[PDB]
Design a protein around this motif. Structure first.
Motif, PDB file in Angstrom:
ATOM      1  N   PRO A 275      26.947  61.567  31.991  1.00  0.00           N
ATOM      2  CA  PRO A 275      26.145  60.334  32.068  1.00  0.00           C
ATOM      3  C   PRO A 275      25.970  59.729  33.471  1.00  0.00           C
ATOM      4  CG  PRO A 275      28.319  59.852  31.186  1.00  0.00           C
ATOM      5  CD  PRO A 275      28.273  61.340  31.394  1.00  0.00           C
TER       6      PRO A 275
ATOM      7  N   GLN B 161      26.777  53.641  32.120  1.00  0.00           N
ATOM      8  CA  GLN B 161      26.363  53.995  30.763  1.00  0.00           C
ATOM      9  C   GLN B 161      27.372  53.543  29.728  1.00  0.00           C
ATOM     10  OE1 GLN B 161      23.937  55.776  29.035  1.00  0.00           O
ATOM     11  NE2 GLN B 161      25.160  55.877  27.173  1.00  0.00           N
ATOM     12  N   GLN B 162      26.948  53.069  28.567  1.00  0.00           N
ATOM     13  CA  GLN B 162      27.979  52.574  27.673  1.00  0.00           C
ATOM     14  C   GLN B 162      27.883  53.008  26.217  1.00  0.00           C
ATOM     15  OE1 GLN B 162      28.980  48.316  28.058  1.00  0.00           O
ATOM     16  NE2 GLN B 162      30.926  49.013  28.942  1.00  0.00           N
TER      17      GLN B 162
ATOM     18  N   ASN C  27      27.668  56.383  23.617  1.00  0.00           N
ATOM     19  CA  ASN C  27      27.861  57.819  23.475  1.00  0.00           C
ATOM     20  C   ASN C  27      27.974  58.210  22.009  1.00  0.00           C
ATOM     21  OD1 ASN C  27      30.506  60.136  23.848  1.00  0.00           O
ATOM     22  ND2 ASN C  27      28.355  60.558  24.323  1.00  0.00           N
TER      23      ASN C  27
ATOM     24  N   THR D 243      31.619  57.941  13.141  1.00  0.00           N
ATOM     25  CA  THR D 243      31.046  57.108  14.167  1.00  0.00           C
ATOM     26  C   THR D 243      29.569  56.947  13.876  1.00  0.00           C
ATOM     27  OG1 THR D 243      30.995  59.126  15.512  1.00  0.00           O
ATOM     28  CG2 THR D 243      32.630  57.426  16.108  1.00  0.00           C
TER      29      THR D 243
ATOM     30  N   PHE E 148      66.974  67.447  14.009  1.00  0.00           N
ATOM     31  CA  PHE E 148      66.516  68.834  14.112  1.00  0.00           C
ATOM     32  C   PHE E 148      66.987  69.391  15.454  1.00  0.00           C
ATOM     33  CE2 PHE E 148      63.328  71.103  11.232  1.00  0.00           C
ATOM     34  CZ  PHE E 148      63.809  70.525  10.069  1.00  0.00           C
TER      35      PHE E 148
ATOM     36  N   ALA F 248      35.912  53.984  19.821  1.00  0.00           N
ATOM     37  CA  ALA F 248      35.063  55.108  19.402  1.00  0.00           C
ATOM     38  C   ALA F 248      33.679  55.119  20.044  1.00  0.00           C
ATOM     39  CB  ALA F 248      34.927  55.114  17.872  1.00  0.00           C
ATOM     40  N   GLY F 249      33.425  56.133  20.858  1.00  0.00           N
ATOM     41  CA  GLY F 249      32.136  56.235  21.493  1.00  0.00           C
ATOM     42  C   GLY F 249      32.127  55.655  22.890  1.00  0.00           C
TER      43      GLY F 249
ATOM     44  N   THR G 238      32.871  55.503  27.041  1.00  0.00           N
ATOM     45  CA  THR G 238      32.299  56.456  27.983  1.00  0.00           C
ATOM     46  C   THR G 238      33.311  57.218  28.773  1.00  0.00           C
ATOM     47  OG1 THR G 238      30.929  54.554  28.478  1.00  0.00           O
ATOM     48  CG2 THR G 238      30.258  56.709  29.414  1.00  0.00           C
ATOM     49  N   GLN G 239      32.918  58.424  29.170  1.00  0.00           N
ATOM     50  CA  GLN G 239      33.652  59.191  30.147  1.00  0.00           C
ATOM     51  C   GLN G 239      34.190  58.255  31.220  1.00  0.00           C
ATOM     52  OE1 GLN G 239      32.303  62.635  33.285  1.00  0.00           O
ATOM     53  NE2 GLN G 239      32.717  63.139  31.154  1.00  0.00           N
ATOM     54  N   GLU G 240      33.329  57.375  31.734  1.00  0.00           N
ATOM     55  CA  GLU G 240      33.718  56.471  32.816  1.00  0.00           C
ATOM     56  C   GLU G 240      34.741  55.386  32.407  1.00  0.00           C
ATOM     57  OE1 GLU G 240      30.602  55.799  35.869  1.00  0.00           O
ATOM     58  OE2 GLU G 240      31.288  53.714  36.024  1.00  0.00           O
ATOM     59  N   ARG G 241      34.639  54.848  31.192  1.00  0.00           N
ATOM     60  CA  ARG G 241      35.588  53.811  30.753  1.00  0.00           C
ATOM     61  C   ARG G 241      36.993  54.379  30.421  1.00  0.00           C
ATOM     62  NH1 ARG G 241      35.152  51.527  26.808  1.00  0.00           N
ATOM     63  NH2 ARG G 241      33.310  51.240  25.494  1.00  0.00           N
TER      64      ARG G 241
END
Ligand SMILES: CC[C@H]1OC(=O)[C@H](C)[C@@H](O[C@H]2C[C@@](C)(OC)[C@@H](O)[C@H](C)O2)[C@H](C)[C@@H](O[C@@H]2O[C@H](C)C[C@H](N(C)C)[C@H]2O)[C@](C)(O)C[C@@H](C)C(=O)[C@H](C)[C@@H](O)[C@]1(C)O
Ligand SMILES: CCCCCCCCCCCCO[C@@H]1O[C@H](CO)[C@@H](O[C@H]2O[C@H](CO)[C@@H](O)[C@H](O)[C@H]2O)[C@H](O)[C@H]1O
Ligand SMILES: CCCCCCCCCCCCO[C@@H]1O[C@H](CO)[C@@H](O[C@H]2O[C@H](CO)[C@@H](O)[C@H](O)[C@H]2O)[C@H](O)[C@H]1O
Ligand code: NI
Lengths: 1038, 100, 199, 100, 50
Positions: free
Chosen positions: A223, A227-228, A230, C23, E16, E33-34, E36-39
């Motif tokens: 992205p 971008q927010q 996905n 989702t 164990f 859920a959903g 971002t790669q960045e977050r």
């Protein structure tokens, strides 16, 4: 040995350990009807929808077959190329090749043949499997309340069960009696011609409006900064209902009209295929046919399957029941259970005898406790050597009880003897006799494994079978001897009641003991008479010779078997309709059968499972029988059942119906029976080969003096229909040949097109003509092709058509076109003799027609002439053993001369019943010679030893001998013959086997002992009277 | 690009159904991912020949291959033995900010 | 079932599903009619949608002597947000460019990103441990009693850990029964007593 | 038709690179040809189980699969057990009507 | 002593194996859920720095 007599507790622990250890070596051991006898074979299956025999043979088969090079331990390669389009290439391997790696070596050539295969073949699936010829079992499914038909159920089976029965390990192949649901689109050629459309357009359309597509992702990877969101894209998804398959748009007309699929063809949830239809007692049913994987354990696999279905059972449809129409299982179970009944009882029996002759409970517990021990422990010798609790080794326990009992007995007896003679207390008696019979027990253990090992060295699958016996027996033997040194004497000194010099319990308390007097007098009478004859020896030399000779004739004039036939609680009836008849006619016949059994066999037959299919002209029925308990008669056993049944289905039919029971020899050799292969060498054409087959067939039909049932194992050429397509005319009028092809195909052949999601399970999408427009040559006219321009051209516009021949079944053996000719030898005659005559008839056939053998008679041209060397060798070994023990070259002969005396009893036993020189009869015959050996050896032993170590005369020493350990003889043989008794009686499971063992042994035993305690002396004496010069009056040393 | 039900209904179930008659099967468990990856772990009976079982699977898959999507067939369907126990994991970096 | 176990904090502890939830996923319904009408082949609408947002392996090229792949996909910015669907056109049969909103309906739905299957069929993995005090097997048993409490078609099974333990849960006493009988037999042997061993 | 330095770093080196942890590999040598043939010989420690090896080796090669070409992928790559020695060479000749 | 042994036995924790500080461990991060790669990457940096 001696040691333990002063350490009884240490010994009880050695025994209790052998028993508990044999007990754990029992819980974890294979169970089987027979061992794995069948060689490993790997089968390659594939299907070419609509193909014909010559099609598959020239498109898939030879493409696969030629790529099958460099496979390790290859035995032979045979393939069926079918008019049903299926091709099966069974590659059978040398016995004991690694199932798994061979299967790997084959699939790794299939993968080089694969991309040069049809795409229809390649996508319908090519399979490689290690499977048996025969069904381990056949599972039925029915619905009791009639709420659904066969096709519905077939779906339930194939979509709720079958994938896990085929993942159960040990499960080789499953054949499905029915078929899974499919998207069935049955085209109307008229309703197609209206709109000027072809099947081909239906193909394209279906592919088009029904598919999945690689969609992608909103806010995908990678992205852009910040971008927010996905989440995935969802596009075209595969179809769910019949409705949506109607709602497919095939061509939009000028006039606003839509042409839907719904219009052009009828659409239904239907069978992927309608070849095979199954009915259980007439009620409609669909089924599971389990074939066993190469080498895996039967009873283990089958328990795993039972658990899988139990695991699935709470989730079935309303009124959907499982039925079990055919099961090889409860018969092996109840059968071996009967052999166990024998083991327990014959022990109880031996206790009974042991009491009679020793009238003292605690004393009699010595050999009764003794045998339990040696048994338990032998199951343990096997868990150590990797054998199995199988019929052969179990009849091994039964057969070995004789040698076990005889060793325990001679021990406790010589103790009792010495106690009664010399008047010593227990321990000193133990040490005394044990000290006497130790050397004897060792010599006997080694002369007994001197006869039982050579039959262990036999070749072929038969060799697996015989060695099973040889080892259970030799090992059980070593164990009873080892026991006879540890446990046995210990128990003598421990619990044997001390006996005052000169008791012999003679006429003591009267009740139980007039026996003691009467026996006493008679053991004397006996030895008096042993003497009487020991004088004139000549006549007895004669009578003996006579006995020998008789043994011979009787031997020869006895039928040689392979194994026993068994009412296995379950059988089948098989149906062959006249070549090329239809599914519905076959269905007629099979329904007739179902009725016959539910009628004139109501009391014996519980359930019929008829299966129509593979392919129309042939049907079969798995007939399950009402419990054995409710089938008493000689007529209620399968033999007369299938006899009278085949009598029904012989006379009143249009086509032939065998009714039969499966042999116990699962997938191997019959009686006098072979399996011939007629092989093409020069490329003489399916015809020259065919006519050649008829030639060998006719020329062997000429010898009823040698051969019987000379038959091909295929189908003859039936008429095939040729639509010779004119390339030129069709390319002229505007029709591409590709299109004529695929239209004629997807019409009359059908086609697997797309895949759909029914109730969440991916099934196939098959489009084909509706029935009526593709049955009669005439309907060829009903089909058109949209030409290059926009005009439809009829099939009769570019096609010439005519009738011819073709084969529905093209077999290939080792690459080359071949034809399988079965055959049996004359009633009296040997398989090999008849095989010779076949090699002699097949040597006169045309240039390029050669021959070969497979399956059973390959397994037979392998071994033979081995019995005489192994028994000749067993004899040189036994003799050598006796010169050893007896320190004489001339003396051994006496203990050998005994061999006949057991033989003649058993041969007379078989003959005077209705039995046959089979496996059981032979292992038993062995055992009998075993005890004979034992007995005699002890006799000659005591006579020699008295002559040598107590200096007595000839006649006197033998006489002393023969008298003294006679009482044991009699004890042993009663113990046995009574223990054997049950086998020869009972009917119930396996009683063919039982009765086979029993008879031979019992008869063997009678003449054996009560001819030996009269001949063994005479042997020793005439034998000894051909050695040295001091041997009578003797005296000396002290 | 596939979504979870895509791989489940294009690749997985075709593979699962083609996974029959493999020796000493214990249990078969598979993930169908919207990341487009699908993984079918077949755990076997304790002390089975790793190598023979794994060969058996790659040769049943090599038969399911032609009934698969062509995108799948061309990215490759793969078979491996699953320990999760890497002796080592080596990293490689560049100190002067040089490469990504 | 999460609820049925949420009812038993005394037996089971931290019972959790082991998947991902449904989702929101984006559905683009293609009307075959409009697109087949205006002149665009459905293949084209599809694989353009694909090679746009999904990407596509096409060719192989030879970089520095090692064969690597050829992936063609949209640039990032023109394939991020639903509205951007619009920037993409299809060349029809005649020769005209058609926007996706001319033949594509659009909506949001749910779907799951992870479809788990156990032994062939659709399945769902629920991990869990027993209460602080209670033995694992007990909680496994209460789980078999709760998953028995569920609607038609809801079955259960065990895997991995609890499989390796449902096998060897009946073996522990037996090997030691063997151990006791064998040790005693051994000592009785060494000595000469049944009773002296007991010491 | 391809040339040697063409096949070798695409097919040879890509396969060789996966052949580690081969049980008992002694030495590994391969030829890359302009007549289009490409061949990789794996010689092993004396007495390793051949069928066992070929199973392991084709099980490392079916891992080298995702970096090999489609013409190579289409005519068939073979995995086999190899001598370097003819047991014998059988001749076939024609004495008379001398066929070619 | 016997009885005491019994109670002691039952009232002791069943394991164990034991855990071993192996000079190394891991931390795992689960975003909404959903996301971002960045977050997710934000969080991972946060940990990295912690
Ligand atoms: C009782 C139960 C079974 O009995 C047999 O096995 C019969 C009686 C075989 O004859 C005999 C023949 C015999 C003795 O030949 C040496 C032996 O091989 C088999 C096992 O039994 C037949 C005909 C076999 O063919 C034989 O298959 C062999 C692999 C070699 C040969 N061929 C294809 C080249 C061919 O003759 C074959 C394929 O199993 C029959 C198919 C139709 C079946 O699967 C059927 C349903 C069988 O389960 C069965 C009838 O129920
Ligand atoms: C435990 C049960 C066993 C009981 C056995 C009791 C006796 C068995 C039945 C007899 C069978 C053998 O038969 C035996 O033959 C010879 C004949 O050669 C007889 O012996 C006779 O032979 C010659 C006659 O020419 C004489 O020198 C001799 O004195 C005379 O007695 C025996 O008296 C007889 O006993
Ligand atoms: C004490 C030293 C030796 C004493 C032994 C004397 C008698 C022993 C009884 C053996 C007689 C068995 O009877 C005969 O034996 C052999 C196998 O044994 C059979 O032969 C059959 O079995 C084997 C296969 O395993 C093959 O060699 C042969 O091709 C086959 O048809 C005969 O067809 C059978 O009728
Ligand atoms: Ni007398």
């Amino acid at each position: 040995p001696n040691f333990f007599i002063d350490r009884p507790i240490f010994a009880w622990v050695i025994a209790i350990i052998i028993m508990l250890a044999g007990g754990l070596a029992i819980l974890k051991l294979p169970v089987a009807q027979y061992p794995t006898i069948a060689p490993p074979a790997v089968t390659i299956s594939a299907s070419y929808p609509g193909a014909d025999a010559k099609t598959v043979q020239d498109t898939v088969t030879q493409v696969i077959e030629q790529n099958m090079n460099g496979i390790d331990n290859l035995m032979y390669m045979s393939s069926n190329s079918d008019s049903t389009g299926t091709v099966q290439i069974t590659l059978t391997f040398e016995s004991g090749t690694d199932a798994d790696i061979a299967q790997v070596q084959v699939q790794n050539k299939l993968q080089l043949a694969m991309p040069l295969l049809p795409q229809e073949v390649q996508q319908q699936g090519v399979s490689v499997e290690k499977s048996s010829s025969s069904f381990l079992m056949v599972v039925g499914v029915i619905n009791t309340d009639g709420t659904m038909t066969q096709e519905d159920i077939s779906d339930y089976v194939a979509a709720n069960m079958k994938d896990a029965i085929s993942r159960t390990s040990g499960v080789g192949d499953v054949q499905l009696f029915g078929s899974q649901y499919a998207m069935r689109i049955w085209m109307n050629p008229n309703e197609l011609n209206k709109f000027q459309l072809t099947p081909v357009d239906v193909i394209t359309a279906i592919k088009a409006q029904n598919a999945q597509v690689a969609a992608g992702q909103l806010g995908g990877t990678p992205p852009v900064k910040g971008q927010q969101l996905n989440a995935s894209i969802i596009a075209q998804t595969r179809l769910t209902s019949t409705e949506e398959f109607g709602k497919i748009l095939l061509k939009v007309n000028q006039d606003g009209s839509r042409v839907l699929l719904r219009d052009v063809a009828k659409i239904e949830l239907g069978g992927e295929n309608y070849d095979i239809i199954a009915e259980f007692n007439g009620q409609p049913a669909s089924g599971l046919g389990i074939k066993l994987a190469t080498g895996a354990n039967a009873l283990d696999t089958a328990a795993a399957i039972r658990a899988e279905l139990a695991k699935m059972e709470p989730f079935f449809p309303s009124g959907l029941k499982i039925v079990y129409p055919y099961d090889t299982t409860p018969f092996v179970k109840i059968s071996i259970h009967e052999v166990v009944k024998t083991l327990v009882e014959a022990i109880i029996l031996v206790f009974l005898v042991m009491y009679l002759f020793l009238q003292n409970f605690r004393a009699t517990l010595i050999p009764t406790i003794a045998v339990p021990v040696v048994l338990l422990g032998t199951f343990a010798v096997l868990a150590a050597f990797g054998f199995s609790i199988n019929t052969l080794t179990m009849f091994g326990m039964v057969l070995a009880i004789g040698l076990l009992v005889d060793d325990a007995i001679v021990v406790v007896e010589n103790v009792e003897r010495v106690m009664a003679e010399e008047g010593l207390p227990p321990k000193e008696a133990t040490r005394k006799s044990m000290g006497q019979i130790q050397g004897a027990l060792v010599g006997i253990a080694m002369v007994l494994s001197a006869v039982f090992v050579p039959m262990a060295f036999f070749g072929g699958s038969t060799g697996a079978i015989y060695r099973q016996f040889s080892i259970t027996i030799v090992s059980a033997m070593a164990l009873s001897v080892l026991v006879a040194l540890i446990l046995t004497p210990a128990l003598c000194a421990t619990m044997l009641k001390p006996i005052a010099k000169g008791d012999h319990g003679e006429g003591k308390k009267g009740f139980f003991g007039w026996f003691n007097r009467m026996f006493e007098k008679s053991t004397h009478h006996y030895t008096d008479s042993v003497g009487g004859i020991l004088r004139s020896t000549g006549r007895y030399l004669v009578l003996y010779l006579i006995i020998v000779v008789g043994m011979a004739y009787l031997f020869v004039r006895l039928p040689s078997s392979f194994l026993p036939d068994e009412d296995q609680g379950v059988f089948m009836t098989m149906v062959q309709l006249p070549a090329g008849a239809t599914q519905e006619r076959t269905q007629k016949v099979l329904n007739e059968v179902t009725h016959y059994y539910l009628t004139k066999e109501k009391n014996n037959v519980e359930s019929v499972f008829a299966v129509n299919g593979g392919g129309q002209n042939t049907g079969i029925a798995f007939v399950s029988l009402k419990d054995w308990a409710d089938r008493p008669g000689e007529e209620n056993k399968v033999e007369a059942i299938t006899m009278r049944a085949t009598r029904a289905f012989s006379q009143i039919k249009d086509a032939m119906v065998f009714a039969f029971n499966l042999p116990a020899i699962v997938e191997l050799g019959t009686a006098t029976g072979f399996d011939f292969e007629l092989i093409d060498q020069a490329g003489l054409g399916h015809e020259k080969l065919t006519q050649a087959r008829n030639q060998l067939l006719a020329e062997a039909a000429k010898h009823p003096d040698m051969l019987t049932s000379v038959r091909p194992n295929g189908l003859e050429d039936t008429p095939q229909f040729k639509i010779d397509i004119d390339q030129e005319k069709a390319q002229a009028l505007g029709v591409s040949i590709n299109d004529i092809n695929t239209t004629l195909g997807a019409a009359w052949g059908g086609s697997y097109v797309n895949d759909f999601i029914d109730r969440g399970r991916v099934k196939k999408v098959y489009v084909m003509s509706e029935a009526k427009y593709r049955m009669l040559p005439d309907d060829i006219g009903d089909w058109y092709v949209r030409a290059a321009d926009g005009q439809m051209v009829p099939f009769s516009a570019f096609s010439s058509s005519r009738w011819e021949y073709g084969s529905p079944r093209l077999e290939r053996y080792n690459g080359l076109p071949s034809m399988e000719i079965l055959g049996q030898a004359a009633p009296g005659k040997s398989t090999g003799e008849a095989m010779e005559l076949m090699e002699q008839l097949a040597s006169k056939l045309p240039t390029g027609v050669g021959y070969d053998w497979t399956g059973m008679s390959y397994q037979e041209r392998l071994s033979g002439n081995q019995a005489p060397s192994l028994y000749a060798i067993s004899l040189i070994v036994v003799f050598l053993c006796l010169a050893a023990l007896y320190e004489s070259w001339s003396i051994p002969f006496s203990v050998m001369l005994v061999v006949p005396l057991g033989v003649i009893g058993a041969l007379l036993a078989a003959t005077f019943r209705g039995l046959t020189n089979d496996v059981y009869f032979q292992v038993g015959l062995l055992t009998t010679i075993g005890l004979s050996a034992k007995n005699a050896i002890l006799i000659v032993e005591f006579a020699k030893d008295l002559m040598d170590k107590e200096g007595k005369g000839l006649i006197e020493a033998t006489l002393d001998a023969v008298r003294m350990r006679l009482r044991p003889i009699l004890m042993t043989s009663l113990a046995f013959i009574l223990g054997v008794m049950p086998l020869v009686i009972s009917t119930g499971a396996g009683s063919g086997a039982q009765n086979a063992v029993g008879t031979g042994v019992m008869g063997g035993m009678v003449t054996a002992t009560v001819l030996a305690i009269f001949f063994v002396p005479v042997f020793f004496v005439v034998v000894r009277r051909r050695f040295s010069r001091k041997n009578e009056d003797i005296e000396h040393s002290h």
